[PDB]
Amino acid sequence: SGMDEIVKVLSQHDRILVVGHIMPDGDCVSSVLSLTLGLEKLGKEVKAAVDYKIPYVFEKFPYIDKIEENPNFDPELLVVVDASSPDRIGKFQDLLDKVPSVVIDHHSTNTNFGNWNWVDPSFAATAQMIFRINKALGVEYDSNLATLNYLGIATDTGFFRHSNADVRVFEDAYKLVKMGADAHFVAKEILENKRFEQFKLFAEVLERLQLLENGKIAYSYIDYDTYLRHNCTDEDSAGFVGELRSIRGVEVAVLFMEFPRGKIHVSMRSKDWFNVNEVAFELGGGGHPRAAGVTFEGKKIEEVIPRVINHLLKKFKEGVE
Amino acid sequence: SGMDEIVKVLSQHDRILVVGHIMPDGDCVSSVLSLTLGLEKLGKEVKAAVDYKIPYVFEKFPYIDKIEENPNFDPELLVVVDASSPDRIGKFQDLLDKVPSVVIDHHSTNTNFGNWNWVDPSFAATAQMIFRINKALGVEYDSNLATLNYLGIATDTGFFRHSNADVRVFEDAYKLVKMGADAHFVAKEILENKRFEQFKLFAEVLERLQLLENGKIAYSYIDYDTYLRHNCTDEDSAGFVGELRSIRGVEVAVLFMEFPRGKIHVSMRSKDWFNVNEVAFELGGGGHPRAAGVTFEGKKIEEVIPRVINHLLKKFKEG
Ligand SMILES: Nc1ncnc2c1ncn2[C@@H]1O[C@H](COP(=O)(O)O)[C@@H](O)[C@H]1O
Ligand SMILES: Nc1ncnc2c1ncn2[C@@H]1O[C@H](COP(=O)(O)O)[C@@H](O)[C@H]1O
Ligand SMILES: [Ca+2]
Numbered sequence: 001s002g003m004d005e006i007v008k009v010l011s012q013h014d015r016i017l018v019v020g021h022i023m024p025d026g027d028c029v030s031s032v033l034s035l036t037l038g039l040e041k042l043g044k045e046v047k048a049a050v051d052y053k054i055p056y057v058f059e060k061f062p063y064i065d066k067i068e069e070n071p072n073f074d075p076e077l078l079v080v081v082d083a084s085s086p087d088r089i090g091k092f093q094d095l096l097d098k099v100p101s102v103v104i105d106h107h108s109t110n111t112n113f114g115n116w117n118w119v120d121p122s123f124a125a126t127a128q129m130i131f132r133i134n135k136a137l138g139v140e141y142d143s144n145l146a147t148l149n150y151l152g153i154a155t156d157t158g159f160f161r162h163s164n165a166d167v168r169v170f171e172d173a174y175k176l177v178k179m180g181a182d183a184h185f186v187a188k189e190i191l192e193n194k195r196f197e198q199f200k201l202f203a204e205v206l207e208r209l210q211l212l213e214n215g216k217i218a219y220s221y222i223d224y225d226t227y228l229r230h231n232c233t234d235e236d237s238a239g240f241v242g243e244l245r246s247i248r249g250v251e252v253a254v255l256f257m258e259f260p261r262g263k264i265h266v267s268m269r270s271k272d273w274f275n276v277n278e279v280a281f282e283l284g285g286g287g288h289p290r291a292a293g294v295t296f297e298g299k300k301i302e303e304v305i306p307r308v309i310n311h312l313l314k315k316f317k318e319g320v321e
Numbered sequence: 322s323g324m325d326e327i328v329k330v331l332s333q334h335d336r337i338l339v340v341g342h343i344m345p346d347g348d349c350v351s352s353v354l355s356l357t358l359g360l361e362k363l364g365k366e367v368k369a370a371v372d373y374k375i376p377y378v379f380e381k382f383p384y385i386d387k388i389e390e391n392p393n394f395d396p397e398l399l400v401v402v403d404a405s406s407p408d409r410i411g412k413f414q415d416l417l418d419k420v421p422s423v424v425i426d427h428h429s430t431n432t433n434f435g436n437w438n439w440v441d442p443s444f445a446a447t448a449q450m451i452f453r454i455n456k457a458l459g460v461e462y463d464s465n466l467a468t469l470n471y472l473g474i475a476t477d478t479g480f481f482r483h484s485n486a487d488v489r490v491f492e493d494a495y496k497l498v499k500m501g502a503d504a505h506f507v508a509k510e511i512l513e514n515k516r517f518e519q520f521k522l523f524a525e526v527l528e529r530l531q532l533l534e535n536g537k538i539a540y541s542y543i544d545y546d547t548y549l550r551h552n553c554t555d556e557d558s559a560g561f562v563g564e565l566r567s568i569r570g571v572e573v574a575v576l577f578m579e580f581p582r583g584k585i586h587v588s589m590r591s592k593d594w595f596n597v598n599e600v601a602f603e604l605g606g607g608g609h610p611r612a613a614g615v616t617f618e619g620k621k622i623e624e625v626i627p628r629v630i631n632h633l634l635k636k637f638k639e640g
């Protein structure tokens with residue numbers, strides 16, 4: 001239930017599979033690799049897996065190839081990081097009824113689906129929890145491990161810009177940089193790694209932009225054919241919803257993205273007060289008060305936009321009251 | 322010359338004018354207001370001034386109205402922050418050699434134009450120097466002052482993305498947030514304040530973009546008439562050169578900007594290794610190894626662009 005019990009369970013087991021969530025982000029990659037590498041330094045037999053393509057922005061990160069898509073492994077323990085429910089880990093959820101499982105996560109809506117669960121939403125990033133676990137295990141950090149652990153703290157705080165960038169976040173980043181974390185390398189690879197094609201794709205996003213409530217709600221969409229027409233992928237749209245929120249006067253931005261055909265992810269970002277986690281949660285997704293998402297499969301975009309935006313607008317009007 | 326001597330000079334004077342650089346950035350606003358408010362806590366009478374319009378993105382920051390354009394004041398001491406040469410403070414350079422002056426700056430190209438000069442280019446932001454000065458003066462921070470001092474560290478590091486964001490930068494950021502600096506407020510005011518016209522302007526920047534040296538060099542330009550066509554000013558283009566550097570494979574991005582008519586500001590940003598301060602300095606400007614600029618007036622943009630590109634390509638191939 002707490003960190004101490006997790007540390008004991010990790011110490012008790014040797015053959016460990018560490019799994020992150022599908023559609024992985026920086027915190028998923030950071031948490032998976034930092035924990036995997038920490039456990040390996042203890043002499044454990046460990047593999048790492050995510051049931052999803054690892055985005056190209058991570059390709060130069062040290063040990064990125066340790067994260068597998070199709071591991072061949074007979075683990076004694078499954079460790080699930082940064083994933084709020086079983087569906088979030090893809091095909092590895094079939095191991096949950098077969099292999100003892102640890103959950104380490106910072107989502108308030110975590111269903112506590114492990115045999116042991118350490119869930120604390122006061123952390124901005126699961127990577128902060130892995131940091132503390134590794135230290136409690138006696139893991140010695142080198143600069144590569146510091147860099148990998150810094151990654152998740154940076155990405156989940158929007159590089160120290162989001163409402164979750166509190167004193168403990170800054171303290172953790174300070175400690176990791178002191179230990180050799182390459183903060184410039186992480187920013188360059190995540191933020192300064194844009195294919196030029198992303199600009200034309202985003203212009204198409206701007207052209208489709210709809211505004212509601214005196215400009216406080218902004219939403220747009222990318223259909224799958226538009227991805228292909230622009231030689232782009234959902235890896236190319238990753239920062240777009242944040243760019244929509246950066247428009248003056250916008251309080252909540254919503255981006256609907258169809259990739260691949262028939263799979264529609266909708267990203268929600270809010271600025272000052274509106275809880276998008278409650279909207280996403282009620283729609284079957286989840287996240288955090290200022291950043292949340294839900295994924296639909298087998299539905300048509302003309303049907304997804306009304307359902308999401310109508311529910312969003314309902315809650316948004318209730319919030320203004 | 323060092324901080325201790327500067328602190329002693331500041332303590333010896335009770336009527337002080339603090340001045341920042343023209344075309345102010347977050348570090349300028351942060352350093353000017355942080356030092357002004359710190360000195361006021363010692364009971365001194367302090368005015369703050371910049372000979373330029375304060376950008377709209379600062380207008381919700383606490384005490385921003387303390388920065389004046391036309392202060393009426395008879396100071397005993399002039400303190401110039403974050404400014405590498407007299408030209409950089411506009412009309413307040415007329416006070417040099419009339420009011421004893423202190424320079425506090427982090428530019429390697431600083432000409433040492435004060436009576437006392439503490440210049441240390443190892444700092445990512447002048448705001449870090451002001452933070453240390455306020456602590457040495459015995460100032461106690463509240464959350465508004467911490468926010469004001471955090472601002473310059475954040476903007477001069479590109480919100481912790483530039484290569485100057487070292488352990489001391491993160492130590493200072495941590496200590497200021499511990500004292501109540503509102504890191505989220507700062508990021509939203511500076512970065513989430515974009516006019517729609519800003520996106521239309523950037524599209525024409527993209528339409529003019531050129532890549533050189535196999536995609537390692539990116540440059541574009543905005544002429545004055547294009548600002549007017551999109552109902553924009555230099556405030557709207559402020560983050561554009563950073564957006565050009567974020568293109569994959571680009572090592573140096575350069576943006577030529579004519580605003581107002583007949584004034585050309587050339588902005589440079591580099592990623593991994595190219596010393597743009599050398600290029601800008603040799604052209605009459607200055608800055609840092611990864612961020613520098615130069616301003617021309619009375620020159621034609623069609624003659625400025627080829628000459629600057631020519632010099633940049635020469636320096637790029639050297640080292
Ligand atoms: N399909 C989903 N189910 C549950 N939570 C999600 C989902 N998609 C996104 N989230 C959460 O929302 C955050 C950001 O939203 P997004 O950018 O839309 O993925 C993530 O870091 C997750 O915590
Ligand atoms: N006219 C100028 N003279 C000297 N340095 C400049 C000038 N303009 C910009 N810089 C430097 O370039 C850096 C980036 O600002 P800019 O290139 O103006 O966006 C700043 O930190 C300044 O030190
Ligand atoms: Ca669900």
Ligand SMILES: [Mn+2]
Nearest residue numbers: 025027028082
């Ligand atoms: Mn995640």
Ligand SMILES: [Mn+2]
Nearest residue numbers: 027082125126
């Ligand atoms: Mn996370």
Ligand SMILES: [Mn+2]
Nearest residue numbers: 082107287288
């Ligand atoms: Mn999350």
Ligand SMILES: [Mn+2]
Nearest residue numbers: 346348349403
């Ligand atoms: Mn400055």
Ligand SMILES: [Mn+2]
Nearest residue numbers: 348403446447
């Ligand atoms: Mn500065």
Ligand SMILES: [Mn+2]
Nearest residue numbers: 403428608609
């Ligand atoms: Mn400067």
